[PDB]
Amino acid sequence: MNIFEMLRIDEGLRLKIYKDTEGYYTIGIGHLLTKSPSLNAAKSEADKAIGRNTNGVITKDEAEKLFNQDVDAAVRGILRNAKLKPVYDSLDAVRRAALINMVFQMGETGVAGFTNSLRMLQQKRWDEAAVNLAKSRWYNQTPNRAKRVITTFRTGTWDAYK
Ligand SMILES: [Cl-]
Ligand SMILES: [Cl-]
């Protein structure tokens, strides 16, 4: 299992514009297009992202290409963030995939806001960090995905995904 396969299980793949769990326009593998309510603003962002007139539909290839960039961006965002980088550096390979996953879903800003859990992860206090992460809108809004990410952090194994 690896980050790509992990995120592919969490986000799924849709080749036509769709609405995410929060109601925002998305396409592909969890690629957010816009938080605006307009399907047209959504189609525009899609064409700009792909480089062609898409009419809100893309191909598998196009989807994976966006996915590749977005994982790359997630990692570089972590490495560039003063709050995130130390945490990341401190973690083993599996748990790093868990933090990338959170960043991909909620952005660098959001994750960075998990001050206490981050501190507990740095300290390697798995069980306590897992309890802290669960007290969040995140866990309440997408509980199954959250449990999977959280177990990854608690265990350092891919069990939740197997
Ligand atoms: Cl883009
Ligand atoms: Cl969920």
Backbone angle region of 14, left / alpha / beta, with phi > 0 → left and psi within -120 to 50 → alpha = beta
Q: Which ligand is nearest to the CA of 51?
A: 1
Task: With beta carbons less than 8 A apart as the criterion, state whether 158 and 149 touch.
Answer: no
* Residue 20 annotated in active site: yes
Q: Which letter, b or e, does each residue of 82-115 get, where b requires 16 or more Cβ atoms within 10 Å of its Cβ?
A: ebbeebbeebeebbbbbbbbbbbbeebeebbebe
Show Cβ contacts of residue 68 under 8 Å, excluding neighbours closer than 6 positions.
none
For residue 149, the ligand closest to its alpha carbon is 2
Residue pointed to by tokens 């995140």: 138
Q: Name beta bridge partners: 19.
A: 25
| Binding-site annotation: residue ranges | 32, 104, 117, 132
Instruction: Please count the structural domains in the chain.
Output: 1
The tokens of 41 are what?
């603003």
Structural domain of 102: 1-162
The burial of 78, by beta-carbon neighbours within 10 Å (0-12 exposed, 13-18 middle, 19 or more buried), is given as buried
Q: Domain holding 109: CATH number?
A: 1.10.530.40
Closest listed residue to residue 98, CA positions, set 12, 57, 156: 156
How many Å apart are CA 84 and CA 159, to the nearest integer? 25
- In whole angstroms, give the CA distance from residue 100 to residue 107: 10
The Cα–Cα gap between 145 and 127 comes to 18
- Please state, in angstroms and rounded to a whole number, the distance separating the CA atoms of residues 102 and 138: 10
127 flagged as catalytic: no
- For residue 10, give both structure tokens: 């969490």
Tell me the binding residues for substrate: 32, 104, 117, 132
> Contact, 14 vs 20, CB < 8 A?
no
Q: Which of 20, 47, 64, 128 is catalytic?
A: 20
Distance from residue 138's CA to the centre of ligand 2 (Å): 9
CA atoms 160, 116, 74, 80: torsion sign: negative
Distance from the CA of 143 to the center of ligand 2, in angstroms? Answer: 5
Ligand nearest to the CA of 20: 2
- The experimental method behind these coordinates is X-ray
Q: For residues 93 and 133, what is the distance between their CA atoms, to the nearest angstrom?
A: 19
